[PDB]
Amino acid sequence: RVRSITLGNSTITTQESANVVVAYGRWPEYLKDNEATAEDQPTQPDVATCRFYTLESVTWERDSPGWWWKFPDALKDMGLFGQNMYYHYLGRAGYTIHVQCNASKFHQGCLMVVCVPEAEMGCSQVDGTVNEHSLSEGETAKKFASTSTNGTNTVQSIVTNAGMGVGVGNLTIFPHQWINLRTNNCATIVMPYINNVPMDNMFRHHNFTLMIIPFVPLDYSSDSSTYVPITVTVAPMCAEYNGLR
Amino acid sequence: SESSIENFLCRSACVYMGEYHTTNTDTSKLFASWTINARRMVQMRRKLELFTYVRFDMEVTFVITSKQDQGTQLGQDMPPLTHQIMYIPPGGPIPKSVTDYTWQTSTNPSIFWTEGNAPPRMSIPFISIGNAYSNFYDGWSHGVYGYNTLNHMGQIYVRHVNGSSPLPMTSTVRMYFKPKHVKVWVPRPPRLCQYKNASTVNFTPTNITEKRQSINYIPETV
Amino acid sequence: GLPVMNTPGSNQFLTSDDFQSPSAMPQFDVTPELNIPGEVQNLMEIAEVDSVVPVNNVEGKLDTMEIYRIPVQSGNHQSSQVFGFQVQPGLDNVFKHTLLGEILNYYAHWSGSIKLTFVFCGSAMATGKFLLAYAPPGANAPKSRKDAMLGTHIIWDVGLQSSCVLCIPWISQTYTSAGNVTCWYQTGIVVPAGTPTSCSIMCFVSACNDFSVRLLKDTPFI
Amino acid sequence: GLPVMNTPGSNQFLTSDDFQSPSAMPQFDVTPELNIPGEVQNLMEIAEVDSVVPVNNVEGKLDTMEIYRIPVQSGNHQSSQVFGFQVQPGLDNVFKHTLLGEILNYYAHWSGSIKLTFVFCGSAMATGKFLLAYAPPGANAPKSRKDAMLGTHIIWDVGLQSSCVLCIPWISQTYTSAGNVTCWYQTGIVVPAGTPTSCSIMCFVSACNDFSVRLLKDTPFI
Amino acid sequence: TFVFCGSAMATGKFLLAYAPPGANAPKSRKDAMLGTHIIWDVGLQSSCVLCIPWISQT
């Protein structure tokens, strides 16, 4: 009851009892042919964009508020998919995201894993503006805080308002999955391309945001490990660019 | 049936009220202007933020009232007043005086109306080179965070249509706005914090809800 | 030609009228629609989604993640209450700011059935029993574990199931005249050596398919 | 007779309305139409015509025929640039006053494909090679002959062909975010004894059949 | 094949990564994620399998 999956020259292993969320019922696909027939011809890499990219693990401790990543540009240094971001003026893609934990039966805790489109964030100063570095750091995660933040140009990252001004118990409206250390330790989310235009430039726009948020904190006792590792793996799907010839 | 999208959003509201004179010594008080967006009406803003992408037509009605200034001169006998209401599409010339050439450009649609009649009304289609409007944008304008140029919807300008050396008068216009044939995509959670300004999502941290006495407390039954 | 007669109501502006209007941009072909994933036809598609309830809304923790966690304590307390609340979406503080509560607060009359889910977030070594009890509207909340057993209840063994589900059938709106739900320790929690002592429960609320709303009004939150 | 009811909008003058009007000269039969050559149904028939581009719009020659001539110099300069520009009809000075540019400036949104033709006006004894290179929007302009060769380009031998043609596919409007075109000396120009030393190139621009325009507005030139 | 020999109560995650011939070995967890990899949860599976396709010698 273990499946082994190979994309390109990558191989990972999952359990065949996985559960998969397809975001709004829609699988990813190519914009078919004839939105812009004449002088808008696209191309597709399909070479080493369809392959598993694995980020660094994060460390879940007793007081961890949460983590977030921006897509794309979490992959702007990831081999070929990142090269294509510099060579081409427009693009699009869907994604498959796997999130996994490594824990024992003597640990306990609960995580929400959610993919949020257009996650526009607020500044720590009400009459201020957010910086580009405070929104993302690429393949390194940003951190939520457990109290309200200060300083100039920083996202106001108190975890109960999720940086967007809503109640964090209501983020289940988005494509999401629960990880309860008692019953499962994995989550797969398949995201299609969602925009109000068919293609776009991939450097000054963040299509979506992946967030991981503990709702019940990690607990252990006498001589268990004091942390739990979380691992994120991403495979781009049906990527497509403007033709160069 | 009352929770359909059309019955929830397609409702009229006053979104701008402005004043303008026939004679003045400021020359910006001689006309009134408004930029069309749905972010300075706090009740419509919140209902619109439940979705990420929207598509609609606009309908605008104008209620216009005049007054003679309390300055001094009485015994007048005046004909009814005429007004001009000009819509500028995105990518159009903007007037800066009431005597400007742009009040006569053939591609700015315009309405001429005289008091005493029914209130004037124009209908604007979905105007965007994109496929939908967006209530949320996680990007840069090219650089302002959260602002994309596909959301431009145009402007409205109002003036008096007198001749030379007119008599002093003060008018007020109220604009009533209504979206029609509406379609929405990607639902979102409702805004929990108060709005702080009209262009950002900035906020001060807010409590999740209000307290009670204890986790067991249920009020005595009647 | 064509003799004609004007009726009362002519030349009035009614804010909710429905008439054809002249277009100000007739020679403009609009951008065709895109097939964006995630389209919505009705607000009841938002209320049928689960959201986390802040059941622990007591003093000192209205601004932390702790507001969402029901505490299960360690040791032997096998007849004490764990929690209890009245089921009043829209009005009561614990249900007021959820996805279902936020919708219901746009309408002056609503009715349907409600779904509550409970989930145990402890270690896989812990075992024990809870008693979940429901009192109808017009009944007092039970004071002991025994009289809660004498009504409608379910006995929930967390060593066997990690989650329980309840469906409540007679919900309307306006010292409440509403039903209530309570939870009791049947046995107490038992663990082996080397596992955490305390733990937590979480509540999710949603609406069932037969939910209806009437008389759109203004919300009291902005 | 015939009970009737006046709606809002009655007795208003809407500048863009469309109603039947009474004729002031009903008893007058009009002159029948003549079949004049050269009738027009659509403005895109004017934009599909080539017109000469003033590529040499530098100081000291904005009022001479020299503004239209790209200079080709004599001797050996076989890696230097000949010319380069961004492709931005409507906004950029070199394309702004052509037949295509003048039309596009009546509309606030437009899009399509563009056609550029280059013609060599030297003596029939001259030979040599040019490299014509295209960079897409969002790419920097090439700095050398070699990196222009590493992109999309054509090598144009003027001893074989007197003219070259290019079709550019992704044109829209609003430190530009537009594509560009550049020309490089591959070899240098070679002549026999008794022929002029210097020479010229000319550019023609036009639109291809798939061109569209929206939101008529006022032009910024008179 | 890799097999985890710990107690049945232990949980956690590993990242297993493969670089082809002619490529350098990854230096961090993030660039190993950006190549071919599998994420292995030992609370779910006790063993993982890999098949490597281009093997020759000097």
mmCIF file of C-alpha atoms in Angstrom, chain D:
data_model
loop_
_atom_site.group_PDB
_atom_site.id
_atom_site.type_symbol
_atom_site.label_atom_id
_atom_site.label_comp_id
_atom_site.label_asym_id
_atom_site.label_seq_id
_atom_site.Cartn_x
_atom_site.Cartn_y
_atom_site.Cartn_z
ATOM 1 C CA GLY D 1 -58.912 56.591 -23.973
ATOM 2 C CA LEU D 2 -56.121 54.056 -23.681
ATOM 3 C CA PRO D 3 -54.935 54.391 -20.054
ATOM 4 C CA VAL D 4 -51.263 55.310 -20.028
ATOM 5 C CA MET D 5 -48.521 55.841 -17.430
ATOM 6 C CA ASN D 6 -45.394 58.018 -17.738
ATOM 7 C CA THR D 7 -42.112 56.452 -16.571
ATOM 8 C CA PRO D 8 -38.969 58.167 -15.289
ATOM 9 C CA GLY D 9 -36.887 59.541 -18.117
ATOM 10 C CA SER D 10 -39.863 61.315 -19.733
ATOM 11 C CA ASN D 11 -39.230 64.724 -21.368
ATOM 12 C CA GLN D 12 -35.460 64.545 -20.935
ATOM 13 C CA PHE D 13 -32.938 65.270 -23.691
ATOM 14 C CA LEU D 14 -30.336 62.490 -23.823
ATOM 15 C CA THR D 15 -27.491 63.419 -26.167
ATOM 16 C CA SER D 16 -27.130 59.841 -27.411
ATOM 17 C CA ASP D 17 -30.815 58.896 -27.765
ATOM 18 C CA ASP D 18 -32.213 57.314 -30.945
ATOM 19 C CA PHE D 19 -35.755 58.393 -31.807
ATOM 20 C CA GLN D 20 -37.827 59.140 -34.879
ATOM 21 C CA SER D 21 -38.073 62.869 -35.577
ATOM 22 C CA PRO D 22 -40.546 64.994 -37.584
ATOM 23 C CA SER D 23 -39.304 66.220 -40.936
ATOM 24 C CA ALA D 24 -39.397 69.949 -41.598
ATOM 25 C CA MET D 25 -39.453 69.494 -45.391
ATOM 26 C CA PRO D 26 -41.784 66.580 -46.131
ATOM 27 C CA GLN D 27 -42.712 67.627 -49.683
ATOM 28 C CA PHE D 28 -39.178 67.555 -51.075
ATOM 29 C CA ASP D 29 -37.824 64.686 -53.173
ATOM 30 C CA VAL D 30 -34.086 64.361 -52.745
ATOM 31 C CA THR D 31 -31.442 64.062 -55.438
ATOM 32 C CA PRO D 32 -30.720 60.376 -56.109
ATOM 33 C CA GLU D 33 -27.295 59.024 -55.310
ATOM 34 C CA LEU D 34 -24.419 58.880 -57.765
ATOM 35 C CA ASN D 35 -21.980 55.976 -58.037
ATOM 36 C CA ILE D 36 -18.807 57.824 -57.074
ATOM 37 C CA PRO D 37 -15.633 55.703 -57.091
ATOM 38 C CA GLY D 38 -13.846 55.188 -53.810
ATOM 39 C CA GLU D 39 -16.482 54.530 -51.154
ATOM 40 C CA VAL D 40 -15.553 53.657 -47.561
ATOM 41 C CA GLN D 41 -17.461 51.466 -45.086
ATOM 42 C CA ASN D 42 -14.975 51.303 -42.206
ATOM 43 C CA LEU D 43 -11.975 53.187 -40.829
ATOM 44 C CA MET D 44 -9.847 50.052 -40.823
ATOM 45 C CA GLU D 45 -9.637 50.460 -44.591
ATOM 46 C CA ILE D 46 -7.539 53.569 -43.959
ATOM 47 C CA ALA D 47 -5.196 51.908 -41.454
ATOM 48 C CA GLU D 48 -4.391 48.966 -43.751
ATOM 49 C CA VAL D 49 -2.539 51.316 -46.094
ATOM 50 C CA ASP D 50 1.229 51.753 -45.889
ATOM 51 C CA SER D 51 2.717 55.117 -44.985
ATOM 52 C CA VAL D 52 6.275 56.326 -44.597
ATOM 53 C CA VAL D 53 7.765 56.341 -41.092
ATOM 54 C CA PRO D 54 9.940 59.271 -39.926
ATOM 55 C CA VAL D 55 12.593 57.074 -38.305
ATOM 56 C CA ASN D 56 15.267 59.791 -38.363
ATOM 57 C CA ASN D 57 13.437 62.153 -35.947
ATOM 58 C CA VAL D 58 16.478 63.774 -34.381
ATOM 59 C CA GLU D 59 17.460 67.388 -33.906
ATOM 60 C CA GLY D 60 17.996 69.723 -36.834
ATOM 61 C CA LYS D 61 15.916 67.875 -39.379
ATOM 62 C CA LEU D 62 12.305 67.695 -38.174
ATOM 63 C CA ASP D 63 11.215 69.985 -41.029
ATOM 64 C CA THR D 64 12.985 68.401 -44.042
ATOM 65 C CA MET D 65 12.543 65.303 -46.205
ATOM 66 C CA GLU D 66 15.649 63.909 -44.483
ATOM 67 C CA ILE D 67 13.507 62.880 -41.500
ATOM 68 C CA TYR D 68 12.404 59.835 -43.550
ATOM 69 C CA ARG D 69 15.836 58.496 -44.596
ATOM 70 C CA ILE D 70 17.902 56.001 -42.642
ATOM 71 C CA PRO D 71 21.584 56.691 -43.500
ATOM 72 C CA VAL D 72 23.826 53.856 -44.668
ATOM 73 C CA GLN D 73 27.439 54.963 -44.533
ATOM 74 C CA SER D 74 30.454 53.896 -46.532
ATOM 75 C CA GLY D 75 33.494 51.928 -45.520
ATOM 76 C CA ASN D 76 33.913 48.981 -43.204
ATOM 77 C CA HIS D 77 31.782 49.062 -40.043
ATOM 78 C CA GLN D 78 30.650 45.457 -39.965
ATOM 79 C CA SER D 79 29.250 45.195 -36.474
ATOM 80 C CA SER D 80 27.732 48.604 -35.748
ATOM 81 C CA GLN D 81 24.096 49.469 -35.266
ATOM 82 C CA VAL D 82 22.145 51.090 -38.086
ATOM 83 C CA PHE D 83 18.911 51.920 -36.238
ATOM 84 C CA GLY D 84 16.545 50.737 -33.534
ATOM 85 C CA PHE D 85 13.099 51.561 -32.131
ATOM 86 C CA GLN D 86 10.328 50.293 -29.883
ATOM 87 C CA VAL D 87 7.132 49.207 -31.587
ATOM 88 C CA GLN D 88 4.456 51.382 -29.996
ATOM 89 C CA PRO D 89 1.961 52.839 -32.454
ATOM 90 C CA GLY D 90 -0.161 55.555 -31.008
ATOM 91 C CA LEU D 91 2.246 56.548 -28.265
ATOM 92 C CA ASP D 92 5.776 56.663 -29.678
ATOM 93 C CA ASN D 93 6.916 59.707 -31.643
ATOM 94 C CA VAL D 94 8.141 57.776 -34.662
ATOM 95 C CA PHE D 95 4.777 56.043 -35.231
ATOM 96 C CA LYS D 96 2.453 58.708 -33.867
ATOM 97 C CA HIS D 97 1.599 60.753 -36.974
ATOM 98 C CA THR D 98 1.309 57.983 -39.554
ATOM 99 C CA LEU D 99 -1.962 56.832 -41.065
ATOM 100 C CA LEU D 100 -2.125 53.977 -38.550
ATOM 101 C CA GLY D 101 -1.107 56.172 -35.632
ATOM 102 C CA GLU D 102 -3.671 58.864 -36.405
ATOM 103 C CA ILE D 103 -6.522 56.377 -36.380
ATOM 104 C CA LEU D 104 -5.474 54.598 -33.188
ATOM 105 C CA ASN D 105 -5.475 57.942 -31.377
ATOM 106 C CA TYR D 106 -9.266 58.162 -31.705
ATOM 107 C CA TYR D 107 -9.773 55.074 -29.538
ATOM 108 C CA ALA D 108 -8.931 54.205 -25.975
ATOM 109 C CA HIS D 109 -8.293 50.495 -26.538
ATOM 110 C CA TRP D 110 -6.876 48.697 -29.549
ATOM 111 C CA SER D 111 -5.061 45.512 -30.489
ATOM 112 C CA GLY D 112 -3.765 43.543 -33.467
ATOM 113 C CA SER D 113 -0.733 42.716 -35.624
ATOM 114 C CA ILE D 114 1.537 45.129 -37.482
ATOM 115 C CA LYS D 115 3.459 44.973 -40.762
ATOM 116 C CA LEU D 116 6.814 46.684 -41.371
ATOM 117 C CA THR D 117 8.498 46.899 -44.768
ATOM 118 C CA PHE D 118 12.081 48.026 -45.403
ATOM 119 C CA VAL D 119 13.348 49.171 -48.800
ATOM 120 C CA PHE D 120 16.934 49.797 -49.918
ATOM 121 C CA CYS D 121 17.376 52.916 -52.075
ATOM 122 C CA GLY D 122 20.946 52.546 -53.333
ATOM 123 C CA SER D 123 22.500 52.014 -56.722
ATOM 124 C CA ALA D 124 22.117 48.693 -58.486
ATOM 125 C CA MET D 125 25.851 48.015 -58.096
ATOM 126 C CA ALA D 126 25.946 47.973 -54.278
ATOM 127 C CA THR D 127 26.033 44.752 -52.248
ATOM 128 C CA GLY D 128 26.119 43.886 -48.568
ATOM 129 C CA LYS D 129 24.250 42.329 -45.681
ATOM 130 C CA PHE D 130 22.094 43.564 -42.826
ATOM 131 C CA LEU D 131 20.811 41.763 -39.742
ATOM 132 C CA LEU D 132 17.237 42.608 -38.698
ATOM 133 C CA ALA D 133 16.316 41.553 -35.169
ATOM 134 C CA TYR D 134 13.126 41.466 -33.100
ATOM 135 C CA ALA D 135 12.858 41.422 -29.304
ATOM 136 C CA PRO D 136 9.504 40.643 -27.649
ATOM 137 C CA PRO D 137 7.855 42.831 -24.997
ATOM 138 C CA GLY D 138 9.574 42.447 -21.645
ATOM 139 C CA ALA D 139 12.987 41.830 -23.185
ATOM 140 C CA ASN D 140 15.921 44.222 -23.329
ATOM 141 C CA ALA D 141 17.267 45.497 -26.617
ATOM 142 C CA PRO D 142 20.365 43.619 -27.821
ATOM 143 C CA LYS D 143 23.678 45.371 -27.298
ATOM 144 C CA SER D 144 25.809 43.610 -29.911
ATOM 145 C CA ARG D 145 25.516 41.961 -33.287
ATOM 146 C CA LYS D 146 26.102 38.517 -31.746
ATOM 147 C CA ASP D 147 23.292 38.525 -29.212
ATOM 148 C CA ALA D 148 20.969 39.922 -31.852
ATOM 149 C CA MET D 149 21.927 36.844 -33.894
ATOM 150 C CA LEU D 150 21.060 34.647 -30.899
ATOM 151 C CA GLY D 151 17.397 35.807 -31.002
ATOM 152 C CA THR D 152 14.782 36.121 -33.749
ATOM 153 C CA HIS D 153 16.352 37.727 -36.810
ATOM 154 C CA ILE D 154 16.579 37.688 -40.590
ATOM 155 C CA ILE D 155 19.707 38.239 -42.686
ATOM 156 C CA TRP D 156 18.942 40.586 -45.578
ATOM 157 C CA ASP D 157 21.204 40.660 -48.671
ATOM 158 C CA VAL D 158 20.504 43.800 -50.668
ATOM 159 C CA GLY D 159 22.348 42.523 -53.716
ATOM 160 C CA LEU D 160 19.594 39.907 -53.960
ATOM 161 C CA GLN D 161 16.438 41.565 -52.540
ATOM 162 C CA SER D 162 15.565 45.235 -52.428
ATOM 163 C CA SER D 163 12.959 44.900 -49.697
ATOM 164 C CA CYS D 164 12.184 42.948 -46.547
ATOM 165 C CA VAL D 165 8.926 42.384 -44.638
ATOM 166 C CA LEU D 166 8.152 41.744 -40.947
ATOM 167 C CA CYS D 167 4.907 40.895 -39.156
ATOM 168 C CA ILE D 168 4.680 41.582 -35.415
ATOM 169 C CA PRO D 169 1.952 39.666 -33.487
ATOM 170 C CA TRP D 170 1.263 40.994 -29.928
ATOM 171 C CA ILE D 171 0.419 44.705 -30.028
ATOM 172 C CA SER D 172 -1.628 46.509 -27.366
ATOM 173 C CA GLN D 173 -1.376 49.729 -25.421
ATOM 174 C CA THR D 174 -1.336 51.132 -21.879
ATOM 175 C CA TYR D 175 10.052 51.970 -19.318
ATOM 176 C CA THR D 176 7.763 50.849 -22.100
ATOM 177 C CA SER D 177 7.120 47.081 -21.790
ATOM 178 C CA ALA D 178 7.044 46.869 -25.591
ATOM 179 C CA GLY D 179 9.034 44.903 -28.138
ATOM 180 C CA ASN D 180 11.773 46.449 -30.209
ATOM 181 C CA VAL D 181 13.461 46.155 -33.602
ATOM 182 C CA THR D 182 17.132 46.762 -34.410
ATOM 183 C CA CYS D 183 19.356 46.624 -37.470
ATOM 184 C CA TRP D 184 23.044 45.756 -37.633
ATOM 185 C CA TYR D 185 25.823 45.823 -40.237
ATOM 186 C CA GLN D 186 26.694 42.226 -41.006
ATOM 187 C CA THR D 187 29.251 43.005 -43.729
ATOM 188 C CA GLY D 188 29.421 46.576 -44.937
ATOM 189 C CA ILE D 189 28.592 48.011 -48.367
ATOM 190 C CA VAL D 190 30.803 47.272 -51.375
ATOM 191 C CA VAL D 191 30.710 49.204 -54.665
ATOM 192 C CA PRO D 192 32.618 49.344 -57.946
ATOM 193 C CA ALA D 193 34.441 52.393 -59.248
ATOM 194 C CA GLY D 194 32.200 55.300 -60.175
ATOM 195 C CA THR D 195 29.168 54.767 -57.936
ATOM 196 C CA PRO D 196 27.960 56.935 -55.039
ATOM 197 C CA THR D 197 29.369 55.982 -51.658
ATOM 198 C CA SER D 198 26.502 56.550 -49.172
ATOM 199 C CA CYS D 199 22.852 55.451 -49.407
ATOM 200 C CA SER D 200 19.512 55.187 -47.616
ATOM 201 C CA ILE D 201 16.838 52.866 -46.252
ATOM 202 C CA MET D 202 13.102 53.568 -45.933
ATOM 203 C CA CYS D 203 10.470 52.091 -43.590
ATOM 204 C CA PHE D 204 6.748 51.604 -44.272
ATOM 205 C CA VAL D 205 4.165 50.651 -41.640
ATOM 206 C CA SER D 206 0.682 49.168 -41.935
ATOM 207 C CA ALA D 207 -1.907 47.113 -40.036
ATOM 208 C CA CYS D 208 -2.886 43.509 -40.721
ATOM 209 C CA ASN D 209 -6.468 42.371 -41.164
ATOM 210 C CA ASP D 210 -7.062 41.389 -37.527
ATOM 211 C CA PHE D 211 -7.045 44.893 -36.022
ATOM 212 C CA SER D 212 -9.663 46.043 -33.510
ATOM 213 C CA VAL D 213 -10.511 49.322 -31.724
ATOM 214 C CA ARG D 214 -12.826 50.302 -28.852
ATOM 215 C CA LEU D 215 -14.167 53.313 -26.906
ATOM 216 C CA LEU D 216 -14.261 56.263 -29.294
ATOM 217 C CA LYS D 217 -12.824 59.359 -27.611
ATOM 218 C CA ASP D 218 -11.382 62.733 -28.550
ATOM 219 C CA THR D 219 -8.037 63.091 -30.228
ATOM 220 C CA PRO D 220 -5.197 65.036 -28.571
ATOM 221 C CA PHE D 221 -3.899 66.886 -31.660
ATOM 222 C CA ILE D 222 -6.186 69.847 -32.385
#
